[PDB]
Every structure is written in structure tokens, then in C-alpha cells.
Amino acid sequence: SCIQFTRHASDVLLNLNRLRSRDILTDVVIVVSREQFRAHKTVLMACSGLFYSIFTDQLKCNLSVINLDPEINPEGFCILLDFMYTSRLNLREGNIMAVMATAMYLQMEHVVDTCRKFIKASE
Amino acid sequence: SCIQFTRHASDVLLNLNRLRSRDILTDVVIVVSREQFRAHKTVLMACSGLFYSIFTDQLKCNLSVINLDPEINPEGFCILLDFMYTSRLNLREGNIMAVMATAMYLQMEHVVDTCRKFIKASE
């Protein structure tokens, strides 16, 4: 018999992104080649099958630094990290291959789906 | 020029609630009289003006235990904590006064609004 506030989940996500921008309560640095990205482990796990696996691991759960595969593109990661915190995906002709490869590695199925559909439309 | 995934914010919140149920990466215990509630500081801040103030404080940000005012009802807190993590509010005739008082203390304006409207309709 609950009532539901339609905008609540979006409002929560907006405030999680504000915390990220102010570097408040971030508990991990994701290293992608020469670049570093601070984030909240809980948000990373909630968005990515890869981070969900990493941070449920009894040893990796306590790491303050995670290094991604050297083939991962920092811009592609940046675009996906922004997506995690906003629901908005900056998908462009110039970045789609990198975004799709990063989403496959991060196990972000909905992003992979759409990248596949956008690529199929251009061929 | 971003695209947006409509269900993303709800999917994130669902996974944050799963983390809470499994007690994964919870970093605070909220004590309400004889009861204890484990939660994620980032979610509490994102939902409540009171927790936002508490956890941006340079000393309180590092506390693992927060004790609420003894006038706060544990059931009212439980209902609001469930709301934070699900967007669903279990508002009943038997709990509305406690929920509204707890929402005022926690500074959860949208919950206060609706409690006020439901009370006005019954008088």
C-alpha cells in the first residue's frame, strides 16, 4: 500500500553526482593509463558488472586504487563514469568504438546495446 | 547532444538497496533509541538535509555511529530509510504522525509535504 515519489531516484543520483564533483566520500581511484578518476565504490558496483565483481571480492573490496586494463581508453571511461552518475551518455561518431569497448569491459549491457544499434544504423 | 537511459536512476537505486540488504560497504550505524540501522552515508546525505549537514561536517563525517534525538520514533525512521533506498513510502493512519515528525527532523521536504496533505484530507 506504499505511495511512490516519481523523481526520488533521479534526485538521489543528482546528489551522488554532486558528491563526486566535490570529491566528498569518494573511496576509490580508478586508474586508466595516465588518468585518474575518483568515484564511490557503491555507485560503480550499482552500474557495472565488472565493479560489482571487483568490490564483492573479500580482498579487492578494501583497495583504494583499481588499475584497469591498459587497452581501456580514458575518454571512453570518462564518458561511462559520467553516464553512471547522470543517466546521460555522450555518444558521438568519434568516440562510439571506445565507448562500446569500455562498456563491454565494464559489463554495462544497456550501453553495449545501444552502441551496437547505433553502429548497425551507420553500416 | 547526450542520449539518456530512462530507467538508469531507478536501477542504480535498486542496486544501492541490494547493497544495504547485504550490508555491503555500509559505513554508518544510525542509532534511534534501542534500534540500529546500517546505511551508506552517501545515500543518507543525498536524501536528507540533516544527514547532508552532519556528513559535510569536518568531524562528524568520520563517525561510524550517529545517535538521533531520543524523541525520534524507530519505526518512523525505518519507514523513511526504506523510502530513501526505494522511492516508496509506507504511509499509514497508524504511522503518519511519526513519519511526518521524523521527516521534519531529517529535513525531507517532499515527505513532509505529502504527510501534510494526507493529514489535511482527514480533518
Binding site: 505511495i3 511512490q4 515519489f5 516519481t6 | 516508496r88 505529502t114
Partner: peptide, 4 residues
């Protein structure tokens, strides 16, 4: 607010 809505009836979900």
C-alpha cells in the same frame, strides 16, 4: 507522488 503516485500509486505505483
Amino acid at each position: 507522488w503516485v500509486i505505483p
